[PDB]
């Protein structure tokens, strides 16, 4: 078709970012793979 | 069944309430993993072993018991392509190379150890490893 | 036995905002806005 | 502190056993009443029975299996079927 | 048609007859943010509706018909709408013509235009789910609806059958005496959604039923969603209708590949 | 009960000089009335 | 900066026929119906003068993992529900594949951030992979209670009457209706065979089917429609030492007709459900008697 | 833009505009206490206990291992203009 | 472009404020959040009201205002601008009118506070 | 609407902007209904305004005459300490209350030359300016404070609050830094033994070596390795310094 993207102008008295609220989010492990690690005395210590 | 179902519900709150405050204590990760193995649930048990490799991935008694979880139930390719991660993580560790050899010895295919020792001698280990070859 | 601090990022990935909630602190108000360059 | 929490544990252990003997006896009269939810304290509380807790899938290995998985669900469906009758 | 297409929709309730937005009296002081009564104990604050839907009398053409509105007036379903022919929503029962226009939108919305939710609810209340197409309406509160007089369970079944019959294609009805529960399945999702709003908090008793003067004191008949059917005959019948509707779209999913080539 | 100091001497002193301590003084916009009495309190004074 | 960079997911059916459509972007609009996190929301109207505004309900991350439209919640390739798309793929493959949903409010919050995928979407996203299964669909299309007594009920049933083709009443009796066949399909064919379309708004006919007693009861209005119904019933069975019955012909299922002339009132078929199961077994013997 | 060393025995190199790690140097066996950049050569040195290694910053590439055996815990590192 | 603001009837602002006396309908839920957003700007509206107060020689003052269309807040949109020799003559004329009245009246009664 | 959204319907707000309890409160309700200064400073400010506005309403109703209107406006502005409780919430406004009292002393003596005593001086222009200038500084502060309170109502209070090193938590924070710094230096001298079990034992010797320095007793552990002994001694001397 086509898409024209327009930002709407907000009421300055309304709570801006009506989705915004303090929340805790536990985040998963990132997608990139694992790097290789590449590396008598017990009676003393 | 609810004699067992609320049993399984109650135990999972007790171990994960503890691991919440102690991400460390690798002994509790293994014990809580072994509980889910005995429930005949390998989907949940593999999750706990993957979640525990995130906390430490150099504690190789965690690695070995996750191979033992896979071979006792005789799921073989999950323990095979695991080793594409395990020794590509820690190439210097002796026991991770030895265990993936001797398990292949009991599965009797010596075409596979013909390519394992190929890399493991290109890697220049040292005297105790060259002599077993 | 404290045994471990809190890693900062577990706060930083929280989805309040990139910013805090929208609290305006008195010490984060503008001041000393012109940097000084040496010759 | 330590003695109180052991005594308060065995009190809490009694409240289940008194409850679970009610349902074993209510099964005898036929009326099946389920176990309730232990109501959520804060807003974002978890039920660890209902889902996998923090489901981390293992890896995308080159050694595609797609054969053992069948046996795993066959064993698990065999297990809870034995729980459904023999009661462990 | 005879009821709907020729007429214009009438006004069920005048605006001066509309009920007060303030609820009755639950506690000591009225909270003006949440619009509730505070400081005390609530007293089982449900109540029956003073009004109801009259399908043949109240249907007619609306301004939503001339504009091309998809959705139905929820206050028409309740029997409360005060606009009449001015209202921007449809005042008639959903039918196979309009439901064909509720095809792309009905997956996530209901027939009134309200979004559906992922989880159902702990008590299977108001709106539906966008995971499961549930065409069966639970009926409860039948003791409260009949105003605590006695009837035989065969006669209760018929009194449920009649008032639900007008609201759309009724698949099946099976009143249970062991659990006083009505399981009313329709042909369409959109007629179950319409009937759930329309008969919620109503009275079953008829004007000749000797308690028509006193029926407002009740609680009405609860209308929630119905759970999965535990008897194994319908579960195999569920498996049957799953398979045959699958093959119907096995035909069309190789026709749009045939169009693709 | 062994170490803490008794309240009863402060209350004794304060009650004695209470028409001067709780005097009407200057108007501050309102006055607080003690419940179930008609005693007005002309400051926030806990010992009184 | 991960919020605003990925693009939206709208199918061509939601978006319409219009050339160029203006949309509204709100960077912290509603929260996702699936993941319950704030996300950027989009408004559009298909035409410039529509009554209805279309709104993205789920975020782009939850839509990518299911390969679905953000509004339809239908498939991006096949435009079918997820409750169906797994079941069709479960037929082509001998494995069973589903889309699991997280109940816990934080675990569903955890679930949306992983970038793998789940369910049938791993098939339906790839063009080459999805074509092989639609190909295999064609090959499948090539493959093509005794103790309770019910006596007082059974006397009211007019077990022994004919299509005498007289006016009689509006009221008829139906049986051999099996656990199948919703009441609308009966009342459609009766309206289709009598010829009247839109039977329900006219309120010409009334049906009671009990579905546990396996028998059904029919009422008409304006009795001249009633004999016209009998005038359209072609199939008969002249029972050998009995009275004839007209037969309704739904697909593969047979429903036999007697004029009532005194039957009505719910209790007619059975008071409780077990009393209907006993009447099911009573008629199952009598239908076997009727055919052989 | 930013080089960092921590007690998890790794040295990380950072892409700051993408906010992510360009390279992870994993060769040190214990906690890496000290770093110093060369003033001329565009390289970083890092020290672990008994282990001092130098690195080129263009690639995650080991330049030299040092004769730092038996030297103990290293607290600080300093590079001079004259390659000291 | 830029056309300036439409000057609206003063009855339009009255009707909106008389409507928002009793907000029990659900139609008022977004406007209630606008009353809490207006609370940050209330000491600014107080300053505009109090600097534009009538002086004792004028009976009534008409002021330009700016109001939110939900009637949450009204700002007085003017500045009290004076000619300084005229203004000093205005107050000093008021000064002498006030000194004659205190001499001339036998008993001056003072207003009661608060007035209501 | 703010008082009701909190749930505080036992708190009554009258039309002269007094906040009145209606009831005896529980301990739980008393903790819940404490309002900040930003609420109460906003309320006292509405109360001064409602006061002045209603003085103009009485004249426009015809209850008072023009001379009484000027005397009442001039009375409010010199008695804001007596009429509102604005100083309870931001006490620096006593500068403004004392400057209006100073201006009233110099104005009353010009106005009442060869006149008597009693009301009737409505020259309110100097004290009006004092309150207009006070507003100038109160706008930015209340804009920030009311903005913070209102943001907490719709979005919540963040869970990422980092508390600073103040004088009441200084000894606790010194503890955690010395405890982490001692475990670092000892775990880097150990070859490859263990990290979890020995660690609690090591910090018990540190706390014990500090009780010995304070008691002036020598700290000798007979089978302790010499490099673990020199790290604990170095860090005990640093704490003692
Ligand atoms: O305390 P006093 O020596 O009797 O002085 C009073 C007092 O003024 P200050 O206390 O502010 O100096 C009165 O003020 P309040 O007692 O009401 O605070 C004031 O009366 P108003 O301010 O109410 O007008 C009155 O002045 P007057 O009697 O002219 O009204 C004035 O007496 P002096 O004019 O002798 O100072
Ligand atoms: Zn309407
Ligand atoms: Zn989402
Ligand atoms: Zn779509």
From Swiss-Prot, chain C:
Where it sits in the cell: the answer is: Nucleus
- Renumbered residue ranges of the record's region Disordered: 1-18
Spell out the family assignment given in the record's similarity comment: Belongs to the CWC15 family.
What is its biological role? Involved in pre-mRNA splicing.
Please describe the quaternary structure of this protein.
Belongs to the CWC complex (or CEF1-associated complex), a spliceosome sub-complex reminiscent of a late-stage spliceosome composed of the U2, U5 and U6 snRNAs and at least BUD13, BRR2, CDC40, CEF1, CLF1, CUS1, CWC2, CWC15, CWC21, CWC22, CWC23, CWC24, CWC25, CWC27, ECM2, HSH155, IST3, ISY1, LEA1, MSL1, NTC20, PRP8, PRP9, PRP11, PRP19, PRP21, PRP22, PRP45, PRP46, SLU7, SMB1, SMD1, SMD2, SMD3, SMX2, SMX3, SNT309, SNU114, SPP2, SYF1, SYF2, RSE1 and YJU2.
Q: What is this protein called?
A: Pre-mRNA-splicing factor CWC15
State the taxonomy lineage: Eukaryota, Fungi, Dikarya, Ascomycota, Saccharomycotina
Gene it is expressed from:
CWC15
What fragment of the whole protein does this chain represent? 3 to 41 of 175
UniProtKB/Swiss-Prot annotation, chain D:
Source organism: Saccharomyces cerevisiae (strain ATCC 204508 / S288c)
The primary gene name is CEF1
Q: What is the lineage of its organism?
A: Eukaryota, Fungi, Dikarya, Ascomycota, Saccharomycotina
Give from-to of the shown chain within the full protein: 166 to 253 of 590
Q: Give the quaternary structure.
A: Belongs to the NTC complex (or PRP19-associated complex), composed of at least CEF1, CLF1, ISY1, NTC20, SNT309, SYF1, SYF2, and PRP19.
Quote the record's miscellaneous comment. Present with 784 molecules/cell in log phase SD medium.
Q: Where is this protein found?
A: Cytoplasm; Nucleus
Protein name, per record: Pre-mRNA-splicing factor CEF1
Q: What family does the Swiss-Prot or TrEMBL record give for this protein?
A: Belongs to the CEF1 family.
Record's function text: Involved in pre-mRNA splicing and cell cycle control. Required for the binding of the NTC complex (or PRP19-associated complex) components to the spliceosome to mediate conformational rearrangement or to stabilize the structure of the spliceosome after U4 snRNA dissociation, which leads to spliceosome maturation. Its absence leads to an arrest of the cell cycle, possibly due to the inefficient splicing of TUB1.
């Amino acid at each position: 078709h086509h898409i024209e993207v327009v930002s709407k102008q907000m009421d300055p008295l309304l709570p801006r970012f009506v989705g915004k609220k303090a929340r805790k989010v536990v985040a998963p492990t990132e997608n990139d793979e694992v790097v290789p690690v590449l590396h008598a005395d017990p009676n003393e210590w | 069944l609810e004699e067992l179902r609320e049993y399984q519900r109650r135990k999972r709150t007790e171990y994960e309430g503890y691991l919440k405050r102690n991400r460390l204590d690798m002994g509790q990760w293994i014990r809580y993993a072994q509980f889910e193995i005995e429930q005949h649930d390998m989907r949940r048990a593999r999750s706990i072993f993957e979640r525990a490799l995130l906390v430490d991935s150099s504690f190789i008694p965690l690695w070995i018991r996750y191979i033992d979880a896979e071979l006792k139930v005789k799921c073989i390719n999950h323990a095979r392509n695991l080793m594409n991660r395990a020794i590509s993580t820690l190439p210097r560790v002796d026991k991770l190379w030895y265990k993936y050899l001797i398990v292949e010895e009991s599965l009797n295919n010596v075409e596979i150890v013909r390519s394992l020792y190929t890399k493991w001698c290109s890697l220049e280990p040292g005297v105790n490893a060259w002599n077993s070859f | 036995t404290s045994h471990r601090p809190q890693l900062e990022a577990r706060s930083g990935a929280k989805a309040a905002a990139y910013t805090p909630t929208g609290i305006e602190h008195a010490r984060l108000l503008p001041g000393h806005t012109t940097l000084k360059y040496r010759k | 502190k330590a003695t109180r929490k052991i005594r308060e544990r065995m009190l809490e252990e009694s409240k289940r056993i008194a409850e679970l003997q009610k349902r074993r006896e209510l099964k005898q009269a036929g009326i099946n009443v389920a176990i309730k939810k232990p109501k959520k304290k804060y807003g974002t509380d978890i039920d660890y029975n209902e889902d996998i807790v923090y489901e981390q899938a293992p890896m995308p290995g080159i050694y595609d299996t797609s054969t053992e998985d069948r046996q795993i669900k066959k064993k698990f469906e065999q297990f809870e079927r034995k729980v459904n009758r023999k009661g462990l | 048609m005879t009821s709907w297409r020729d007429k214009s929709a009438k006004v069920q309730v005048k605006e001066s007859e509309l009920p007060s937005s303030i609820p009755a009296q639950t506690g000591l002081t009225f909270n003006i943010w949440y619009n509730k009564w505070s400081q005390g104990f609530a007293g089982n604050t449900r109540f029956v509706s003073p009004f109801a839907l009259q399908p043949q009398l109240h249907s007619g053409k609306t301004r939503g018909d001339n504009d091309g509105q998809l959705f139905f007036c929820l206050f028409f379903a309740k029997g409360m709408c005060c606009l009449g022919p001015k209202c921007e929503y449809l005042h008639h029962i959903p039918d196979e013509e309009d439901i064909g226009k509720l095809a792309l939108r009905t997956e996530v919305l209901d027939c009134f235009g309200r979004e559906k939710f992922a989880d159902y609810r702990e008590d299977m209340g108001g709106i539906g789910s966008f995971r499961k197409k549930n065409k069966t309406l639970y009926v409860g509160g039948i003791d409260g609806a009949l105003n605590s007089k006695h009837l035989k369970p065969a006669q209760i079944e018929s009194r449920i059958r009649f008032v639900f019959s007008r609201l759309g294609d009724i698949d099946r009805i099976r009143y249970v005496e062991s659990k006083n529960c009505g399981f009313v399945k329709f042909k369409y999702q959109a007629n179950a959604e319409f009937a759930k709003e329309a008969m919620s908090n109503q009275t079953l008793l008829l004007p000749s039923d000797k308690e028509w003067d006193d029926r407002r004191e009740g609680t009405g008949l609860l209308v929630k969603w119905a759970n999965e059917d535990p008897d194994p005959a319908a579960q195999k019948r569920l498996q049957e209708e799953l398979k045959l509707e699958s093959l119907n779209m096995m035909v069309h999913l190789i026709n749009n590949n045939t169009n693709s080539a | 009960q062994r170490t803490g100091l008794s309240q009863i001497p402060n209350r004794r002193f304060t009650l004695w000089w209470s028409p001067t301590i709780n005097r009407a003084n200057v108007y501050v916009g309102f006055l607080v009335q003690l419940d179930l009495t008609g005693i007005f309190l002309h400051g926030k004074i806990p010992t009184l | 900066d991960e919020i605003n960079e990925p693009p939206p997911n709208i199918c061509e059916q939601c978006l319409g026929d219009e050339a160029n459509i203006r949309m509204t972007k709100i960077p912290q609009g509603s929260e996702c119906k699936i993941c319950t996190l704030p996300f950027t929301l989009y408004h559009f109207k298909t035409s410039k003068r529509s009554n209805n505004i279309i709104k993205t309900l789920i975020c782009v991350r939850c839509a990518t993992q299911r390969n679905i439209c953000q509004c339809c919640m239908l498939d991006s390739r096949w435009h079918i529900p997820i409750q169906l798309r797994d079941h069709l793929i479960s037929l082509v493959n001998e494995e069973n594949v589903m889309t699991e949903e997280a109940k816990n409010d934080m675990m569903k919050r955890f679930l949306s951030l992983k970038n793998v995928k789940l369910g049938g979407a791993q098939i339906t996203s790839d063009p080459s992979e999805a074509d092989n299964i639609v190909d295999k669909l064609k090959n499948i299309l090539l493959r093509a209670y005794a103790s309770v007594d019910i006596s007082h009920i059974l006397k009211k049933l007019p077990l022994n009457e004919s299509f005498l083709k007289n006016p009689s009443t509006k009221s008829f009796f139906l049986y051999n209706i099996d656990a199948s066949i919703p009441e609308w399909k009966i009342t459609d064919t009766v309206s289709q065979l009598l010829g009247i379309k839109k039977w329900k708004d006219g309120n010409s006919l009334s049906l009671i089917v009990n579905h546990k007693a396996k028998c059904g009861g029919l009422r008409f209005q304006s009795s001249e429609l009633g004999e016209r119904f009998v005038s359209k019933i072609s199939e008969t069975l002249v029972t050998p030492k009995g009275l004839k019955r007209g037969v309704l012909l739904i697909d593969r299922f047979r429903i036999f007709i007697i004029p009532w002339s005194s039957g009505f009132s719910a209790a007619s078929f059975g008071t409780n459900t077990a009393e209907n199961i006993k009447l099911s077994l009573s008629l199952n013997k009598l239908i076997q008697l009727e055919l052989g | 833009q930013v080089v960092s060393s921590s007690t998890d025995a790794t040295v990380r190199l950072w892409d700051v505009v993408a906010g992510k790690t360009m390279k992870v140097l994993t060769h040190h066996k214990r906690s890496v206490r000290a770093t110093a950049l060369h003033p001329k050569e565009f390289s970083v040195a890092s020290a672990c206990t008994d282990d001092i290694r130098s690195w080129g910053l263009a690639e995650g590439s080991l330049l030299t291992n040092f004769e730092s055996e038996k030297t103990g815990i290293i607290n600080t590192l300093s590079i001079n203009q004259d390659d000291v | 472009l830029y056309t300036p603001k439409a000057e609206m009837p003063p009855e339009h602002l009255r009707k909106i404020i008389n409507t928002h006396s009793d907000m029990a309908s659900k139609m008022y839920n977004t406007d209630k959040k606008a009353f809490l957003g207006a609370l940050k700007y209330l000491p600014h509206a107080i300053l505009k009201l109090l600097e534009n107060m009538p002086h004792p020689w004028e009976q009534a003052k008409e002021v330009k205002v700016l109001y939110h269309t939900s009637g949450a807040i009204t700002f007085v949109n003017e500045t009290p601008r004076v000619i300084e020799p005229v203004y000093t003559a205005q107050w000093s004329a008021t000064w002498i009118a006030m000194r004659r009245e205190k001499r001339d009246r036998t008993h001056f009664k003072r207003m009661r506070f608060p007035p209501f | 609407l703010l008082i009701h959204r909190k749930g505080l319907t036992y708190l009554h707000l009258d039309y002269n902007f007094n906040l009145k309890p209606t009831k005896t409160l529980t301990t739980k309700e008393r903790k819940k209904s404490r309002l900040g200064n930003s609420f109460h400073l906003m309320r006292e400010l509405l109360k001064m305004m409602k006061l002045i506005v209603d003085t103009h309403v009485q004249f426009r109703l015809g209850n008072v005459d023009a001379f009484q209107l000027a005397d009442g406006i001039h009375y409010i502005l010199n008695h804001i300490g007596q009429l509102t409780g604005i100083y309870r919430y931001k006490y620096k406004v006593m500068h403004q209350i004392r400057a209006c009292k100073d201006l009233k002393h110099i104005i009353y003596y010009k106005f009442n030359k060869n006149l008597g005593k009693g009301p009737g001086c409505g020259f309110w222009q100097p004290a009006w300016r004092v309150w207009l200038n006070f507003l100038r500084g109160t706008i930015p502060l209340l804009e920030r404070y009311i903005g913070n309170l209102i943001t907490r109502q719709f979005e919540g209070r963040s869970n990422e609050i980092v508390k600073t090193t103040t004088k009441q938590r200084l000894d606790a924070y010194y503890d955690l830094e010395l405890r982490n710094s001692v475990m670092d230096d000892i775990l880097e001298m150990m070859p490859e033994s263990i990290r979890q079990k020995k660690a609690r034992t090591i910090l018990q010797h540190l706390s014990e070596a500090w009780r010995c320095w304070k008691a002036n007793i020598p700290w000798d552990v007979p089978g302790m390795p010499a490099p673990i002994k020199k790290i604990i001694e170095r860090y005990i001397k640093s704490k003692a310094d």
